[PDB]
Amino acid sequence: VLAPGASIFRCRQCGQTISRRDWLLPMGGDHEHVVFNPAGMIFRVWCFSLAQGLRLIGAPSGEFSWFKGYDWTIALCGQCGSHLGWHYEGGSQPQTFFGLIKDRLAEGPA
Numbered sequence: 001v002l003a004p005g006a007s008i009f010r011c012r013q014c015g016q017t018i019s020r021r022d023w024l025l026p027m028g029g030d031h032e033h034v035v036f037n038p039a040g041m042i043f044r045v046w047c048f049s050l051a052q053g054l055r056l057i058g059a060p061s062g063e064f065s066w067f068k069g070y071d072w073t074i075a076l077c078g079q080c081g082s083h084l085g086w087h088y089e090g091g092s093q094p095q096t097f098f099g100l101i102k103d104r105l106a107e108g109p110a
């Protein structure tokens with residue numbers, strides 16, 4: 001389409017470019033996964049094949065992973081440090097992907 005407005009995802013706090021709607025990834029048949037951590041926090045996680053602009057912190061862990069076969073690392077906004085989600089690795093088809101917290105991103109034109 002011409003002049004799309006639902007094209008890219010930026011960090012909600014600072015505007016860093018993070019991902020693209022084209023890169024949404026339907027893990028287990030859905031790009032959206034509603035999940036909770038051990039602290040009881042609920043996240044609406046959108047899975048993306050690719051992302052940029054993040055800083056991945058520490059070494060991977062399999063503990064409490066929401067995605068069978070994958071280990072996670074915390075993904076912060078590389079610009080402002082906002083916690084945007086997790087990077088997943090060590091699994092199969094795909095080996096890696098990103099799970100980003102939908103309400104911590106702003107969607108907009110390319």
Ligand SMILES: O=C1CC[C@H](N2C(=O)c3ccccc3C2=O)C(=O)N1
Nearest residue numbers: 036037038039063064065066072086
């Ligand atoms: O797949 C994941 C990513 C990490 C996530 N997670 C959290 O968000 C968290 C907060 C506090 C203590 C421990 C955890 C943890 O494993 C979680 O529970 N599963």
Ligand SMILES: N[C@@H](CC(=O)O)C(=O)O
Nearest residue numbers: 007008016017018109110
């Ligand atoms: N979508 C932008 C690229 C960006 O802002 O990251 C452009 O077409 O110039």
Ligand SMILES: [Zn+2]
Nearest residue numbers: 011014077080
């Ligand atoms: Zn940011």
